[PDB]
Amino acid sequence: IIIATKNGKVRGMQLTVFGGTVTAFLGIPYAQPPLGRLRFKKPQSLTKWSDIWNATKYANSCCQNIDQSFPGFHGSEMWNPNTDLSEDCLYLNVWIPAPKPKNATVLIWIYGGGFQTGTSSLHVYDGKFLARVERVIVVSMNYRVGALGFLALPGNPEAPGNMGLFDQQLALQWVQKNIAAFGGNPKSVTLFGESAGAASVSLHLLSPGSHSLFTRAILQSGSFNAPWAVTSLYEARNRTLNLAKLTGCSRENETEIIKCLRNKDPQEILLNEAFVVPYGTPLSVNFGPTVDGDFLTDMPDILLELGQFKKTQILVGVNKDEGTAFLVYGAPGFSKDNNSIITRKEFQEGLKIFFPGVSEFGKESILFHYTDWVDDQRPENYREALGDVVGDYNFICPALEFTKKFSEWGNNAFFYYFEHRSSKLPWPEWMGVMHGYEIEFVFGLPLERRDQYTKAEEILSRSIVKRWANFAKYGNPQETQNQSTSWPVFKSTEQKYLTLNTESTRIMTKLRAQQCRFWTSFFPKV
Numbered sequence: 001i002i003i004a005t006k007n008g009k010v011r012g013m014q015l016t017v018f019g020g021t022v023t024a025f026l027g028i029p030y031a032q033p034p035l036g037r038l039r040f041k042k043p044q045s046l047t048k049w050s051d052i053w054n055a056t057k058y059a060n061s062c063c064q065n066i067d068q069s070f071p072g073f074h075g076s077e078m079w080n081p082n083t084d085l086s087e088d089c090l091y092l093n094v095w096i097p098a099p100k101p102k103n104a105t106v107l108i109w110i111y112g113g114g115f116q117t118g119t120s121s122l123h124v125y126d127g128k129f130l131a132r133v134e135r136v137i138v139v140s141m142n143y144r145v146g147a148l149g150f151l152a153l154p155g156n157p158e159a160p161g162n163m164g165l166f167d168q169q170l171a172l173q174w175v176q177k178n179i180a181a182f183g184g185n186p187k188s189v190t191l192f193g194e195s196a197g198a199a200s201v202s203l204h205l206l207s208p209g210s211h212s213l214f215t216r217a218i219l220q221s222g223s224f225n226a227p228w229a230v231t232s233l234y235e236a237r238n239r240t241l242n243l244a245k246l247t248g249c250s251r252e253n254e255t256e257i258i259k260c261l262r263n264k265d266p267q268e269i270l271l272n273e274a275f276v277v278p279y280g281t282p283l284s285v286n287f288g289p290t291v292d293g294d295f296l297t298d299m300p301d302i303l304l305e306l307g308q309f310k311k312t313q314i315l316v317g318v319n320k321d322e323g324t325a326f327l328v329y330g331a332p333g334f335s336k337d338n339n340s341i342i343t344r345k346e347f348q349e350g351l352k353i354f355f356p357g358v359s360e361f362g363k364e365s366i367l368f369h370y371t372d373w374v375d376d377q378r379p380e381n382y383r384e385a386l387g388d389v390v391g392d393y394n395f396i397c398p399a400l401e402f403t404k405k406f407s408e409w410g411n412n413a414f415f416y417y418f419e420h421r422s423s424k425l426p427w428p429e430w431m432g433v434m435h436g437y438e439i440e441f442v443f444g445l446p447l448e449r450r451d452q453y454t455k456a457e458e459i460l461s462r463s464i465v466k467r468w469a470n471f472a473k474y475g476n477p478q479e480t481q482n483q484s485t486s487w488p489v490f491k492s493t494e495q496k497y498l499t500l501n502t503e504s505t506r507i508m509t510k511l512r513a514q515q516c517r518f519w520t521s522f523f524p525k526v
């Protein structure tokens with residue numbers, strides 16, 4: 001029940017899972033609380049304690065603005081924090097199998113939320129099923145988000161940027177120093193995340209200071225090269241200065257600005273965070289990762305292209321309808337409560353919402369490539385095209401480009417295309433296989449037979465859980481016992497990928513080849 005860590009004893013709690021037991025340690029602190037003069041700084045290491053820390057409930061989530069677009073609707077509120085918001089939020093969770101393992105592989109989850117939101121205590125990130133079913137140890141941490149985690153005066157140590165990434169890193173360090181006392185193997189750690197968590201995982205592959213802190217990596221619906229994932233140093237500075245203007249903290253001495261922002265209440269910072277972008281999008285990342293010369297020594301496109309990353313195996317994938325969720329957060333004619341048949345004019349309006357800084361020719365070129373169809377009279381033509389535009393540009397084509405570039409340096413990569421819509425999905429049918437709704441299958445919630453998932457969904461989750469655990473333990477995401485389809489390595493020539501669904505997994509080639517030729521070759525020129 002009690003485990004001695006290098007900073008003090010911690011007490012866990014026993015959970016009953018599927019007729020067995022998991023030991024959960026919820027809310028272990030891993031840094032000094034970043035309060036007062038510590039706000040906006042890199043996380044500081046933690047002073048030893050003498051008593052028994054009680055890790056028996058999720059800790060505070062980090063300060064963040066909540067989605068209030070659909071009050072009372074589980075489809076959006078299931079992503080909102082479920083613990084008190086607080087700056088005192090640098091805590092992590094550990095699920096270990098019972099009986100205690102001897103040298104268990106470790107899975108470390110990094111949640112998404114656009115680097116502005118998210119928390120490890122969400123129900124769909126409960127690691128007790130993975131620890132129980134596959135006997136891995138599951139670790140998850142809270143890391144600072146928004147301005148509090150990513151405000152950047154690049155080069156200034158009072159606000160250097162990338163603080164939430166350093167929070168994540170300090171938790172990986174905690175696993176290296178402490179997980180053996182929990183029965184874990186520090187030499188067998190796989191990071192996984194979804195995104196912004198996936199984008200975070202891909203940047204740990206790029207950061208030399210994280211290379212010794214993990215073994216393998218899983219990227220669900222995200223990578224750093226996605227257009228929403230990294231802020232240029234230019235916007236980063238202009239966004240810091242805008243927040244100072246909005247808070248009345250405009251000073252000349254850039255350090256006096258940060259001091260002024262340290263005496264503001266978190267709410268004042270949070271409510272001003274929204275309007276710092278001039279023209280935002282539903283996918284806007286207001287304060288995100290930047291090139292800081294510390295965590296990220298150069299522009300990450302350059303690092304990827306020139307092979308400057310940890311050589312290891314990766315598992316990468318995307319969902320069939322990544323873009324649809326975002327259409328009801330601003331695109332005209334769209335609504336979760338009707339079938340969202342939009343016209344050509346509404347589609348053109350929609351592009352202006354998702355490509356605010358792009359020229360007319362750039363938007364016309366998107367329209368040209370996505371509006372040549374079979375039957376012109378199909379009324380959902382424009383509705384589906386906009387979803388595909390948003391999904392291809394923001395998720396599928398960057399993930400494929402990341403995987404191609406990464407595998408070109410000799411490493412084994414595995415790519416999946418998730419295409420099962422959960423039977424319990426509270427969002428409407430036109431949105432299909434949405435962004436975020438593979439997570440519950442990865443974490444094995446449909447293994448709980450009391451949860452109104454179908455039988456085929458329990459099977460699919462069981463297969464996915466085994467593949468993910470085999471990738472983490474062995475670098476190879478196979479399900480070897482129940483004669484599953486073999487998952488081939490993704491090569492830059494053949495570009496084979498595996499489809500995940502309840503009616504036969506299939507090997508396919510060259511996902512969205514024609515669309516991604518537009519987004520990766522043409523569109524960055526505009």
Ligand SMILES: *[C@@H]1O[C@H](CO[C@@H]2O[C@@H](C)[C@@H](O)[C@@H](O)[C@@H]2O)[C@@H](O[C@@H]2O[C@H](CO)[C@@H](O)[C@H](O)[C@H]2NC(C)=O)[C@H](O)[C@H]1NC(C)=O
Pocket residue numbers: 331332333334335337338339340341
């Ligand atoms: C789908 O609904 C949208 C959103 O309208 C709101 O939600 C509905 C469920 C209903 O309660 C409406 O009364 C609400 O206003 C509709 O979008 C509106 O469309 C009209 C006419 O096209 C336009 O004047 C409004 O500005 C739109 N409002 C928006 C975009 O917020 C849309 O027409 C509906 N689609 C279908 C096929 O019925």
Ligand SMILES: *[C@@H]1O[C@H](CO[C@@H]2O[C@@H](C)[C@@H](O)[C@@H](O)[C@@H]2O)[C@@H](O)[C@H](O)[C@H]1NC(C)=O
Pocket residue numbers: 011052053054
């Ligand atoms: C830390 O926890 C100690 C143990 O309390 C336990 O809690 C209940 C729910 C049962 O599980 C039972 O085993 C114990 O009573 C406390 O005695 C101690 O006060 C706690 N310390 C702090 C600071 O909360």
Ligand SMILES: *[C@@H]1O[C@H](CO[C@@H]2O[C@@H](C)[C@@H](O)[C@@H](O)[C@@H]2O)[C@@H](O)[C@H](O)[C@H]1NC(C)=O
Pocket residue numbers: 102103185187188189215472473474
């Ligand atoms: C625990 O296991 C260690 C070896 O781990 C294995 O090798 C590394 C390189 C990874 O590929 C990982 O996935 C493997 O599981 C041993 O060196 C170590 O001595 C073991 N310690 C104990 C206490 O059993």
Ligand SMILES: *[C@@H]1O[C@H](CO[C@@H]2O[C@@H](C)[C@@H](O)[C@@H](O)[C@@H]2O)[C@@H](O)[C@H](O)[C@H]1NC(C)=O
Pocket residue numbers: 459462463466479481482
């Ligand atoms: C594999 O399947 C188990 C039950 O299926 C039965 O056993 C397999 C070996 C086949 O013979 C099949 O025809 C049988 O119906 C599940 O209990 C188990 O969880 C499955 N494992 C995975 C990893 O999916």
Ligand SMILES: CN(CCC1CCCCCC1)Cc1c[nH]c2c(O)cccc12
Pocket residue numbers: 067075076079114280281282283284325329330434435436
């Ligand atoms: C980015 N959206 C995420 C919501 C969905 C929920 C279900 C699918 C899976 C998770 C993502 C919300 C949002 C944050 N900021 C916004 C902004 O500025 C304008 C408009 C919208 C937003």
Ligand SMILES: *[C@@H]1O[C@H](CO)[C@@H](O)[C@H](O)[C@H]1NC(C)=O
Pocket residue numbers: 238239241242245278
């Ligand atoms: C940030 O950029 C916008 C857009 O050009 C500009 O209007 C604004 O002045 C900039 N912020 C500052 C503090 O200059």
Ligand SMILES: *[C@@H]1O[C@H](CO)[C@@H](O)[C@H](O)[C@H]1NC(C)=O
Pocket residue numbers: 253254255256
């Ligand atoms: C601003 O920061 C501190 C003030 O406490 C000090 O280094 C100095 O007065 C200022 N530095 C510059 C470069 O203006």
Ligand SMILES: [Cl-]
Pocket residue numbers: 036037259262263
């Ligand atoms: Cl201060």
Ligand SMILES: [Cl-]
Pocket residue numbers: 082122123
């Ligand atoms: Cl909950």
Ligand SMILES: [Cl-]
Pocket residue numbers: none
């Ligand atoms: Cl089994």
Ligand SMILES: [Cl-]
Pocket residue numbers: 320
């Ligand atoms: Cl498809």
Ligand SMILES: [Cl-]
Pocket residue numbers: 459460463501502
């Ligand atoms: Cl299956």
Ligand SMILES: [Cl-]
Pocket residue numbers: 509510
């Ligand atoms: Cl082919």
Ligand SMILES: [Cl-]
Pocket residue numbers: 510511512513
């Ligand atoms: Cl395709």
Ligand code: NA
Pocket residue numbers: 512
């Ligand atoms: Na397709």
